[PDB]
Write a protein that binds this ligand. Structure first.
Ligand SMILES: Cc1cn([C@H]2C[C@H](O)[C@@H](COP(=O)(O)O)O2)c(=O)[nH]c1=O
Ligand SMILES: Cc1cn([C@H]2C[C@H](O)[C@@H](COP(=O)(O)O)O2)c(=O)[nH]c1=O
Ligand SMILES: [Mg+2]
Ligand SMILES: [Mg+2]
Lengths: 208, 208
């Protein structure tokens, strides 16, 4: 079973992955996790991150260039994902293809039924062959609270300063809205919308 | 020995590679060739090409995004290049790293000592580990004649319509000028500047 955890920056995805993995293991299932972007393991992922921190000329100014880099990062992980799915009972991803649809549409002020989301579908699932997730869990949180978490992280960790997307409050708001639409539309597969107070044990039961 | 053939679009590079390969083989040396972008064998190369033909939103509008895609294409060929160099006496490339420096600098109206060329050096040779060529042969041709060849190709081949770069006469002119500077500076290694009437036999002897 392939599960992807989605949501805006600072929504609490990393923590939910930890809790969810614990719940599944407590139920006797083997779990493997992977986070995108694969910082350090992908040139594409690293250049993308660096561009969001002000490097690489005009790269970050292109919405499709950024989307392509994140897609190329995942392209390099296709075999790894397939291998994990046949080796473990559950594979949980901290961000996946939907992140590209949500952020790209939001940067272009488009909705889930727009051009960018359709492009992501065509490129990542059909062309690159990335498997569609069995479940996509949207950790919905107020744009205000998520932004507060991102700012707090930068304050206590010099290695986690905010990037261009995180500094854009309006973009984060629009991204959250597109995510809600993607979930309602069942984009890329079935979705579940949860809040910060979701119970890991029952969520795992729902996904199982 | 690693040799890269450089020059603007329609300069006659593909033909020179054929003639040069023949000369080396006539001298008893084993030869292997590779052309960049690796159309069909690289997602990065294909998306780059498609962007130059009007697809993928705002991707082509970013100079660094295009450069990154061509660099990622080469990154996926590092092992292939190293393998060919230890398996054959001579390895000839139809375009290599210098193409990225020349075209990127030209799109930004910069010279060979500018920011873009320096970025290509840092990213491709140092960071990606691409081997520096023993020789880089600049097939210098009048911008007018090269443009005529590109237009003629599109006229007789529906599968070879010109792309955004080829349709930009001024860009082609500036690229030729940056190439001349790169050669004079010995950027990335030693260069040889030749014309359309260069003798394949003697050129091969010079490179040998
Ligand atoms: C994985 C992924 C992330 N992003 C984003 C959202 C984040 O603001 C930024 C880096 O992700 P991160 O916050 O998970 O480290 O890039 C995309 O736009 N597309 C993608 O496919
Ligand atoms: C290989 C390569 C090509 N290019 C260009 C020059 C050509 O106009 C275009 C496609 O190359 P081609 O003419 O050899 O098919 O992309 C770069 O800008 N950087 C590179 O690294
Ligand atoms: Mg982030
Ligand atoms: Mg061309």
């Amino acid at each position: 079973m392939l599960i992807a955890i989605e949501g805006v920056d600072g929504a609490g995805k990393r923590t939910l992955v930890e809790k969810l993995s614990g719940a599944f293991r407590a139920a006797g299932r083997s779990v493997a996790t992977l986070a995108f972007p694969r910082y350090g393991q992908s040139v594409a992922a690293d250049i993308a991150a660096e561009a969001l921190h002000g490097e690489h000329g005009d790269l970050a100014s292109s919405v499709y260039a950024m989307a392509t880099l994140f897609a190329l990062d995942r392209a390099g992980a296709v075999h790894t994902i397939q291998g994990l799915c046949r080796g473990y009972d559950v594979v949980i991803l901290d961000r996946y293809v939907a992140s590209n649809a949500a952020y790209s549409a939001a940067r272009l002020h488009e909705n889930a039924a727009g051009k960018a989301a359709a492009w992501v579908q065509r490129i990542e699932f059909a062309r690159l062959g990335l498997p569609k997730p069995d479940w996509q869990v949207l950790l919905a949180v107020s744009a205000e609270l998520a932004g507060e978490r991102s700012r707090g992280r930068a304050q206590r960790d010099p290695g986690r300063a905010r990037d261009n997307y995180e500094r854009d409050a309006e973009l984060q708001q629009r991204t959250g809205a597109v995510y809600a639409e993607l979930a309602a539309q069942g984009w890329g597969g079935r979705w579940l919308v949860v809040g910060a107070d979701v119970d890991p044990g029952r969520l795992a039961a729902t996904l199982a």
